[PDB]
Amino acid sequence: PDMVLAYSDERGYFIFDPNEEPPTGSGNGETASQVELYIDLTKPLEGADFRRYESPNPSTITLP
Amino acid sequence: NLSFTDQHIKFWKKIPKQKAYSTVEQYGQLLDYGRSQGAFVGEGVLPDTNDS
Amino acid sequence: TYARKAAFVKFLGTTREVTHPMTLVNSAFGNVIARQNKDGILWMLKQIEQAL
């Protein structure tokens, strides 16, 4: 019938199906997954061994 | 040759070799994954925090 | 003779936390969130193994 059992979320999207499960879990600002993705993007090459590129040692080969 | 040759050197050949970059070398270790404090909580109850 | 039994589901959990400045500093051993998650998973695995 008429759109009486209709609702919208905080972002302006409307759901017209009373039996459709609405998405949830949007109230946790600064989500941990977002923080992990941000760390992966803004800080690449973290934990890499670059000590070899500033070594003045003429011998770069390890032998017994 | 009445003395030893290089064929009698065993432990020196077997130990793995790594390259050093200073007179002091540092490394980190992992000891535990957390203290033993029980892992059962119940329905709709926030579990306790842990650290390594 | 016949019988009818019942089993009850139980819940396990743990919580991991990381402070904000720890996420900003330059840290070795790679990403910190992944390390904490791996530690939590291994601790839960040990707890499940002993509870079994």
């Binding site: - | 200073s22 002091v24 540092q26 490394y27 980190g28 | -």
Partner: peptide, 29 residues
């Protein structure tokens, strides 16, 4: 002469030991 030394505490580095950066293995054992 200028020597590197075997000093760990950063606040006690003197002479040639003040030129040394830390050498940290990137693998967690």
């Amino acid at each position: 002469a200028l020597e590197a030394g075997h000093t760990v505490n950063p606040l006690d580095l003197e002479g040639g030991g003040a030129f040394r950066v830390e050498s940290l293995e990137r693998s967690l054992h």
